[PDB]
Amino acid sequence: GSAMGEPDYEVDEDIFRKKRLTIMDLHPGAGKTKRILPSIVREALKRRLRTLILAPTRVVAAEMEEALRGLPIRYQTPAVKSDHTGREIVDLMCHATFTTRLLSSTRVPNYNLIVMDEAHFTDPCSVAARGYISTRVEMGEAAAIFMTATPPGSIDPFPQSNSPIEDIEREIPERSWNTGFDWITDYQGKTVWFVPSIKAGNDIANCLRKSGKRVIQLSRKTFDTEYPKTKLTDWDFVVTTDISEMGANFRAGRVIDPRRCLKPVILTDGPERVILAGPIPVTPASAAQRRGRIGRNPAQEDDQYVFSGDPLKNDEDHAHWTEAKMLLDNIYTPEGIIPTLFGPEREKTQAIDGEFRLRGEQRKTFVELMRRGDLPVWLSYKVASAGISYKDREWCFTGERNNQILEENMEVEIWTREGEKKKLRPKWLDARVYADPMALKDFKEFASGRK
RNA sequence: AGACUAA
Ligand SMILES: Nc1ncnc2c1ncn2[C@@H]1O[C@H](COP(=O)(O)OP(=O)(O)NP(=O)(O)O)[C@@H](O)[C@H]1O
Ligand SMILES: [Cl-]
Ligand SMILES: [Mn+2]
């Protein structure tokens, strides 16, 4: 038994048995990351198990380090510093980092125990990782624990909380507002506001600041400076992307959740391509995770979740289910077997088993395009599978007439590293590389041969 | 779009 936030002395021996995959589906704020996890890691260390701990984001990694501080853990995330003797038998890294390692030249340690926090995360690397882990368990090579308040097959957007939550449906602004949204700025406590993009966040964040509100903006771009400020440190609003959707302990009073998101979609009608669809409603799991950021303190009983609209459970057109198979078809176990997707995540797309496996140089290029080229999984797969070498950018100019990329209604031109002027007209279209002007800027550098 | 950045 346990008290006071401290990890339990008593840990179920069952969870360490090879072939055991344990699902810990406790509600948000139950203590998965900060109470249960450290008790498991302590017991793993006693059992001398080579252990891997996986966090979906640096926000979750940061939470874990708070819980695990003082224990012999090798942190393999920029979110955390620093040990490090090299003799640690416990590693901690992000979901996507692990999948990167699996696809790379370096081999992963043979972990006896794998702990995946937020094991519902629909990022394609996280899905592919779950495939690998459940295969390692099934083969009897490891024991694994999947922790999440919203396991796959979750439908309930309003789960149990530590403290009562007042759920309120209201219209929520997507852009700056002049008037008519007084409930936003009249609230006295601390608010966490989820935004679908950094750009949307910027606009909302500056609009709050002209009211004298202290606003902290959180995303992949500002995490390093700004996350400690959510901890130290008094503020009014956190305007955040989904970087904060899981695991965050903001000690806040209110969540504002427009329940909207853009979604990449693979289009099959005509030449295959990726578009950015929406904004569309979020999934029930995302809604529940976002809501879960409040009602976390039983001593604080008046927390609010302000949301707009219903969630949309059907995300079978989201490119992530295909992109997960593209990654997993190119991952192996030392015994030779290509992993299959974790059970509840099978047949989200229609197969085909091994359809995406790449041979020889094609696999290395595939990985390079993602890691060095910063290209999406789908686009990297398309280029690699065409037998194109990483440095060969001819494909950026040889697309059909319809594939010409426009910016401010003008045909995008590229000056190559050799000094040719060519119209940007890629053989494959993925909106993720051209929709946002910052993404387009990076894709232009790629096309130029400067990446 | 959002997330990741390892040996
Ligand atoms: N630094 C802190 N100070 C006070 N309370 C905290 C702190 N960190 C966490 N808590 C509380 O400890 C409880 C357990 O937190 P945690 O282990 O993050 O829960 P969890 O089950 O992982 N939640 P989630 O990730 O939302 O599914 C919650 O009630 C938190 O509000
Ligand atoms: Cl909290
Ligand atoms: Mn957690």
Ligand nearest to the CA of A29: 1
Which residues lie below 8 Å from residue A419, measured CB to CB, with a gap of 6+? none
CA of A186 to C1' of B6 (A): 45
Three-state SS at A194: strand
Stated as kind and residue range, the H or E segment containing A383 is helix A377-385
Encoded tokens for A377: 């999984």
Does residue A236 sit in the same domain as residue A277? yes
Does residue A240 sit in the same domain as residue A266? yes
Does residue A177 sit in the same domain as residue A31? no
What is the resolution of the experimental data for this entry, in Å?
A: 1.9
- Domain containing residue A31: CATH number: 3.40.50.300
A33 is in an annotated binding site: yes
Q: Give the residue from A113, A68, A74 showing the smallest Cα distance to A97.
A: A74
Three-state SS at A59: helix
Does residue A145 sit in the same domain as residue A216? no
Does residue A73 sit in the same domain as residue A148? yes
Q: How many domains does chain A have?
A: 3
For residue A164, say if its preceding peptide bond is cis, omega within 30 degrees of 0: no
- Ligand 1 atom with minimal separation from the A26 CA: 21
A68: β partners: none
- Establish whether the CB of A433 is closer than 7 Å to any nucleic acid atom in strand B: no
Which residues of A in 12-31 have their CB below 7 Å from strand B's atoms?
Answer: none
User: Which residue, of A299, A334, A352, is where some domain finishes?
Assistant: A352
- DSSP line for A286-350: HHHHHHTTSS--TT---EEEEE-S------TTBHHHHHHHHHHTT---TTSPPPPPPGGGTTSS-
- Domain hosting residue A164, numbered range: 155-314
- Establish whether the CB of A372 is closer than 7 Å to any nucleic acid atom in strand B: no
Ligand nearest to the CA of A289: 1
Three-state SS at A433: helix
Are residues A263 and A318 in contact, defined by beta-carbon separation less than 8 angstroms?
yes
Which residue's alpha carbon is at the shortest distance from the C1' of B7? A106
d(CA A330, CA A14): 32
Stated as kind and residue range, the H or E segment containing A370 is helix A361-371
- Establish whether the CB of A437 is closer than 7 Å to any nucleic acid atom in strand B: no
Q: How far apart are the first and last CA of chain A?
A: 55
Q: Give the residue from A40, A58, A72, A56 showing the smallest Cα distance to A116.
A: A56
A276: β partners: A264
User: A429: how many CB neighbours lie within 10 A of its CB?
Assistant: 22
Does residue A236 sit in the same domain as residue A364? no
Does residue A142 sit in the same domain as residue A5? yes
Stated as kind and residue range, the H or E segment containing A21 is strand A21-24
Ligand 1-lining residues (CB < 6 angstroms): A 26, 28-35, 63, 149, 162, 246-247, 249, 292, 296-297
Q: What is the DSSP letter of A430?
A: B
- Establish whether the CB of A57 is closer than 7 Å to any nucleic acid atom in strand B: yes
Which residues of A in 245-284 have their CB below 7 Å from strand B's atoms?
Answer: 261-264, 276
- Ligand 1 atom with minimal separation from the A66 CA: 1
Say how far residue A274 (Cα) sits from the centre of its chain: 19
User: A63: how many CB neighbours lie within 10 A of its CB?
Assistant: 21
Q: What angle do CA A154, A157, A162 make, to 5 degrees?
A: 105
CA of A221 to C1' of B5 (A): 13
Are residues A179 and A210 in contact, defined by beta-carbon separation less than 8 angstroms?
no
Q: Give the residue from A428, A378, A379, A382 showing the smallest Cα distance to A405.
A: A428
Does residue A420 sit in the same domain as residue A444? yes
Q: Give the residue from A59, A30, A286, A264 showing the smallest Cα distance to A152.
A: A286
Three-state SS at A158: coil
Does residue A48 sit in the same domain as residue A139? yes
- Establish whether the CB of A61 is closer than 7 Å to any nucleic acid atom in strand B: yes
d(CA A216, CA A259): 20
With both helix axes pointing from N to C terminus, report the angle between A319-328 and A124-138 in degrees, rounded to the nearest 10.
50
Does residue A16 sit in the same domain as residue A4? yes
How many CA atoms lie less than 13 Å away from A360 in the CB half-sphere?
5
Give me the long-range contacts of A436-444 (CB less than 8 A, separation at least 24).
A436/A197, A436/A199, A437/A407, A440/A405, A440/A407, A440/A412, A442/A374, A444/A412, A444/A414
The label of the residue with tokens 């998101």 reads A261
Which of the nucleotides in strand B have any atom less than 7 Å away from a protein CB atom?
Answer: 1-7
A281: β partners: A260
d(CA A154, CA A157): 8
Q: How was this structure determined?
A: X-ray
Sequence positions preceding breaks in chain A, C–N over 2.5 Å: none
Which residues lie below 8 Å from residue A248, measured CB to CB, with a gap of 6+? A59, A60, A63, A192, A293
How far is ligand 1, taken at its centre, from the CA of residue A423, in Å?
A: 52
- Establish whether the CB of A436 is closer than 7 Å to any nucleic acid atom in strand B: yes
- Establish whether the CB of A426 is closer than 7 Å to any nucleic acid atom in strand B: no
User: Which residue, of A291, A314, A337, is where some domain finishes?
Assistant: A314
Does residue A205 sit in the same domain as residue A272? yes
With both helix axes pointing from N to C terminus, report the angle between A58-68 and A37-46 in degrees, rounded to the nearest 10.
60
Mutate to test the pocket of ligand 1, among A24, A33, A158, A232 (most ligand atoms within 8 A of CB): A33
d(CA A143, CA A21): 6
A152 is in an annotated binding site: no
A419: alpha, beta or left, given left = phi > 0 and alpha = psi -120 to 50? left
CA distances from A60 to A57, A242, A316, A329 (A): 5, 12, 26, 28
d(CA A342, CA A134): 6
- The values of phi and psi at residue A304, to 5°, are -125, 140
User: Which residue, of A314, A329, A344, is where some domain finishes?
Assistant: A314
Nucleotide nearest to A241 (CA to C1'): B2
Does residue A321 sit in the same domain as residue A289? no
Three-state SS at A373: coil
